[PDB]
Amino acid sequence: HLSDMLQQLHSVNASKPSERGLVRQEEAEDPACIPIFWVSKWVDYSDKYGLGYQLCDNSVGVLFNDSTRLILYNDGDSLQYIERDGTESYLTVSSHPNSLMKKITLLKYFRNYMSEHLLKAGANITPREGDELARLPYLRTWFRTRSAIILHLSNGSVQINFFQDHTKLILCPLMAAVTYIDEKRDFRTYRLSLLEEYGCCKELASRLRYARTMVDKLLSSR
């Protein structure tokens, strides 16, 4: 879907949504497209350990330097491990697996740190309804630019948090939608096809051009 995201972001930009006679992005709204998952907290420690993240359901994930991942579930006991090829495994905290015991204790540092010291993003927003027992999405790859950090998940999502103005950009290619969060922390969910029809402001257009550039980077860092 990373390639499908290019085709959606090409059409909206080729229509030039800020250069219109009258901008009406309120008419492009669609609240029923709100994502199920997004990254609420992150911790860079890739110089030693890896990047750790927290999803909106309080689940904590961590991506190690050798491209291996270990996720802890919402009950605080269930552990899912993904290997350096995309192979998944299931085990528990109390019933201690000795081979991963180092990574469990490292995960715990990330988990404690985020619950104690960090601020939750998109907090007030009510998430979308999903299958209760379905699998969690993990982190495929990430990179940092000057202006933003780019988070690419395993469910097709791409999230882009901007550093200076605290704004965030969630891209969902499956039902073709974008969820915006401004600096004053107000959330709006848009349909991209309707964002062509009716257009948007300058800051939404300049960040939808910038997102497209990050997608091209995500295809090139492989």
């Binding site: 911790v43 860079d44 420690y45 740190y113 010291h117």
Partner: peptide, 8 residues
């Protein structure tokens, strides 16, 4: 102690 993290 991390060098970098999300909004604190």
């Amino acid at each position: 102690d991390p060098p970098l993290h999300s909004t604190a």
